[PDB]
Ligand SMILES: Cc1[nH]nc2c1[C@](c1cc(-c3ccc(S(=O)(=O)N(C)CC(F)(F)F)cc3)cc(C(F)(F)F)c1)(C(C)C)C(C#N)=C(N)O2
């Protein structure tokens with residue numbers, strides 16, 4: 001007693017838009033540092049009947065039975081995770097249940113410190129996530145600043161983490177957790193110095209490596225597993241997995257943390273796990289460990305380097321004047337155009353990037369930069385040579401954003417009126433579309 | 443630079459287990475009240491490339507651009523949500539972002555009362571969910587009992603909500619929220635009397651209708667929308683959608699609750715929505731409004747009645763001696779066997795049910811019942827006539843559970859040793875398999 005008519009026939013209305021979405025994704029130059037393109041295999045798992053099953057609990061300690069095959073999938077996924085990130089399953093445990101990055105960071109923070117507990121994180125404006133305790137004066141914006149008591153450290157004038165100020169704050173604040181690893185930070189992290197500071201105060205070291213996860217796995221960047229008590233990552237960014245999250249915990253450094261973390265995820269916060277997610281993660285976490293993926297991850301940095309270099313060659317300023325990872329943040333102050341305006345301009349030419357604060361931006365009302373990243377375009381087959389053109393297209397978009405601001409003014413209402421119909425944007429959009437449309441597309 | 447090889451080739455290890463899962467599902471009599479079988483159209487959406495996109499925020503207020511097609515899907519999903527549940531988009535709003543039931547209830551509860559706020563819910567032993575403030579003496583088991591201050595009301599000796607006690611407690615405790623709608627409650631709810639009590643103390647009326655959502659939608663049970671401020675529902679149970687959740691809020695009764703709820707979901711708790719979930723939900727909420735689904739939902743109740751009746755005819759006891767909805771809870775006390783033991787026995791014969799508490803169970807260590815439900819088997823096409831056999835199979839399972847308990851003893855360790863190889867279980871498993879294996883299977 002069900003309708004099994006294919007998606008096109010059952011609901012033509014929805015299918016049209018999803019087929020439109022498919023076209024835009026195919027015809028866009030996607031520089032969103034947090035985005036990627038899933039392979040078919042991952043998407044077969046996301047569409048499997050394994051999501052019919054309720055399996056509240058952990059494997060072999062399930063609430064319901066009939067969970068033998070589900071138990072195998074969850075166990076295989078935790079194994080591949082610990083393998084992929086080069087940790088022994090004796091020293092490191094992992095929870096594969098978090099439905100996303102924000103849930104994992106709240107779950108993990110709760111486990112360690114509990115309600116009212118004290119936490120330190122990088123400020124949002126300076127590169128930190130919302131779930132690192134972000135708040136405004138106006139409101140406790142993230143639950144992490146409300147259910148916990150939170151303090152926020154900044155990056156210095158030159159766009160680097162200021163370890164001295166981290167210690168200034170950590171000795172006076174005496175936090176129970178210090179979070180490092182960030183959403184829009186273009187350089188590597190001194191996890192050792194963070195570990196040093198946490199010991200001095202007795203705090204936990206929490207490393208959120210969602211953006212740089214493949215660099216850590218592939219031993220291309222600093223390994224936080226040597227120093228951190230807790231490591232969280234999403235699975236959908238540079239890892240190229242589905243929308244989910246992983247919580248790692250150092251058993252050896254803190255016995256009893258396994259239960260604290262596992263009990264925080266279920267039953268403190270979540271209910272039934274989403275098994276299709278867990279299964280999809282399994283399928284990617286195989287791929288992570290194959291040397292072809294190290295090849296990929298290397299290409300991500302090589303492209304990121306060549307993209308930073310070409311932008312500099314065209315006299316565009318970058319925060320910290322370069323990158324150690326997959327992402328760049330452009331400082332647009334010399335052109336007197338906001339990231340607000342350049343995002344609209346890049347939208348009009350099928351270039352996905354996002355506006356981003358820079359250290360000089362005191363408040364997040366009108367950020368002076370844009371963030372870009374290479375994971376997505378690398379996945380579609382683009383090499384170092386191809387970055388000059390992306391650099392070219394971005395330069396041309398910046399120049400046209402100056403033109404349109406001179407013509408229509410500094411207000412964003414007025415600015416946007418200039419975009420529809422502008423001959424150069426149409427010209428440029430079409431170049432973008434011709435080159436992007438033809439690239440390998442999983 | 444990606445591997446486009448099909449799931450079977452890329453990862454044969456995983457595909458085998460998923461193919462196994464598909465066989466067990468096909469060969470099981472699934473009486474899990476909370477489970478169902480997704481149609482292929484829902485699973486095509488769950489496996490779409492629409493999950494590649496980061497769209498933090500709400501429609502037309504997205505942080506990043508390139509979200510025009512994602513905006514249509516989210517808008518379309520909210521429309522069908524409001525349509526399906528018979529509410530005008532002027533009086534009622536709805537958030538479609540929650541990743542699951544447990545997240546939606548925590549998000550909604552925060553919005554209304556905040557950290558340290560007071561909440562009332564049905565006890566877990568009596569039929570409440572964990573996210574209704576569940577705690578034990580030993581620990582604050584759910585975050586809802588920890589980040590909020592919670593008080594827990596029980597059902598009476600006869601397995602009914604005791605409204606006098608709800609008021610006794612609501613006037614003394616003076617909560618800001620009172621939650622109704624439950625996980626294993628076999629009767630309809632007096633939402634009106636709940637509305638009366640909440641007004642009296644000035645509390646919000648929270649209705650969690652995840653288990654009975656289709657009954658509400660189709661006007662077969664009491665409509666909580668006439669009285670409630672907040673209605674939450676999962677989408678994966680009797681609704682037959684993907685794993686997600688919906689938060690409904692009464693704008694008319696409390697203006698400024700739209701933002702309160704929307705801002706609790708993002709950015710208080712979540713980050714990027716999962717668009718494949720949203721698209722999947724859209725595809726099911728089409729189907730919810732079609733009169734064929736009203737036919738389905740009616741069959742769920744018809745089956746549930748006939749199943750309650752047949753179990754009674756075989757001298758099996760039910761909590762409240764019947765059902766108004768999709769689920770029955772069996773009181774196994776007259777046979778001196780636990781739900782614990784009967785679950786294992788039903789597993790051995792490919793019958794999925796779960797152990798459940800009954801009013802007489804003071805503690806939830808060893809429940810004296812099992813919960814069953816008809817949504818999943820009705821989806822596979824089973825009619826009233828077919829419930830006699832399910833009733834037959836269950837009686838036979840109860841009888842064998844007595845036999846094996848006498849032979850091996852009352853300890854669950856000892857009991858289980860009898861199950862492998864038991865001739866009657868094998869005979870009965872094969873009957874189960876022959877009948878289940880052949881039933882229509884989406
Ligand atoms: C959306 C999001 N999630 N996590 C992030 C962000 C980033 C971000 C968050 C925000 C952000 C700022 C404020 C809020 S808010 O406080 O909840 N709220 C909407 C503002 C208020 F209060 F209404 F006025 C929510 C998100 C803003 C920006 C920018 F637009 F100003 F640039 C950027 C980007 C990756 C998009 C960010 C930065 N910069 C960092 N570090 O991390």
Ligand SMILES: Cc1[nH]nc2c1[C@](c1cc(-c3ccc(S(=O)(=O)N(C)CC(F)(F)F)cc3)cc(C(F)(F)F)c1)(C(C)C)C(C#N)=C(N)O2
Pocket residue numbers: 056063267271566567568569570571572578580581583625626796797798799806807808809
């Ligand atoms: C798994 C689950 N989620 N939501 C539920 C349940 C149910 C449930 C939860 C539980 C349950 C009981 C206690 C915990 S607990 O407090 O976190 N924990 C594991 C025990 C402790 F304290 F840690 F040792 C967690 C889950 C137990 C049962 C039963 F085994 F007693 F029967 C049943 C069933 C649907 C499975 C339930 C009931 N009865 C109700 N009302 O709602």
Ligand SMILES: Cc1ncc(COP(=O)(O)O)c(CNCC(=O)O)c1O
Pocket residue numbers: 033034100101102103129131181182183184208209210211234244496712713714715
């Ligand atoms: C360090 C970090 N942690 C958590 C998240 C959030 O994960 P979910 O979206 O899965 O909740 C983000 C992405 N934030 C936005 C971006 O960088 O694009 C992040 O950068």
Ligand SMILES: Cc1ncc(COP(=O)(O)O)c(CNCC(=O)O)c1O
Pocket residue numbers: 054270271272273475476477542543544545547571573623624625626650651652653676686
């Ligand atoms: C009333 C109610 N609310 C919320 C949830 C949470 O749903 P998620 O699993 O999507 O978090 C459940 C799950 N109850 C489990 C069961 O009855 O089988 C529930 O019964």
Ligand SMILES: [Cl-]
Pocket residue numbers: 046274276277488716718719
């Ligand atoms: Cl999903």
